[PDB]
Design a protein around this ligand. Structure first.
Ligand SMILES: [Ca+2]
Ligand SMILES: [Ca+2]
Ligand SMILES: [Ca+2]
Ligand SMILES: [Ca+2]
Length: 240
């Protein structure tokens, strides 16, 4: 199983508030976070999220891998509290927040638990078929899903940019957690919306077809900038 990860400012943003982590030693879990907030930032929130989810998983994986939904929920809440605590304390960064998408693999490696809060995404790629696993926690996504406003078509409405869920909120209840089964040759992609605001699903699928995940990850980031690079962009590419 090969894995590559990459982050980039883009061509507009002066700093990168994205963060990611790959479990290089054991390849059990993978994390991408997209921060927001100034003063700064932002980068604080997404760093906290990645660090706390990582440390919670590291500590409790042995004990709780039989119950991944409980494990992932507690990891996310650990992250959420760490951010809220740094908020409640610090006035300037009181509104800092971040997305997170996490993949946790079962020990066997045939099953992946996908957990997320926000509009960062997880995709699975299998035999030239690209499938978005996570559903965006945005107002307009959840609108289209209902509907109406089921024109897609969705953005550009003003938001688009506005999240219905993010880490760093005392009012956090919804954490989406779902299992997906894996097959040899599948690719997994974790990405911030810096990727998917620039690249259509069709384009992403092309780049995920490259067996070399190092080249694939670099291609994705490079393509996102060619198309505009209006935001921070982060990708983690996993070959199953
Ligand atoms: Ca951001
Ligand atoms: Ca967005
Ligand atoms: Ca973003
Ligand atoms: Ca563009």
């Amino acid at each position: 199983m090969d894995v590559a990860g990459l982050t980039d400012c883009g061509l507009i943003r002066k700093s990168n508030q994205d963060a990611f982590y790959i479990d290089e030693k054991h390849q059990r879990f993978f994390i991408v976070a997209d921060g927001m907030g100034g003063a700064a930032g932002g980068e604080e929130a997404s760093r906290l999220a990645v660090d706390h989810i990582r440390q919670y998983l590291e500590t409790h994986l042995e004990d709780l891998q039989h119950d991944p939904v409980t494990l992932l929920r507690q990891a996310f809440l650990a992250a959420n509290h760490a951010i809220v605590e740094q908020q409640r304390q610090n006035s300037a960064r009181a509104d800092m927040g971040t997305t997170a998408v996490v993949i946790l693999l079962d020990e066997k490696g045939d099953r992946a638990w996908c957990a997320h809060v926000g509009d960062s995404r997880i995709y699975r790629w299998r035999k030239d078929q690209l499938q978005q696993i996570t559903s965006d926690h945005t107002w307009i996504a959840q609108a289209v899903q209902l509907g109406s406003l089921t024109i897609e078509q969705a953005r550009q409405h003003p938001w688009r940019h506005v999240l219905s869920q993010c880490l760093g909120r005392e009012d956090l209840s919804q954490i989406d957690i779902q299992p997906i089964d894996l097959e040899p040759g599948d690719r997994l992609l974790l990405c911030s919306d810096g990727l998917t605001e620039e690249l259509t699903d069709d384009v992403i699928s092309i780049y995920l077809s490259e067996p070399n995940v190092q080249k694939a990850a670099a291609a994705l980031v490079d393509a996102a900038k060619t198309h505009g690079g209006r935001d921070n962009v982060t990708v983690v590419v996993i070959s199953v």
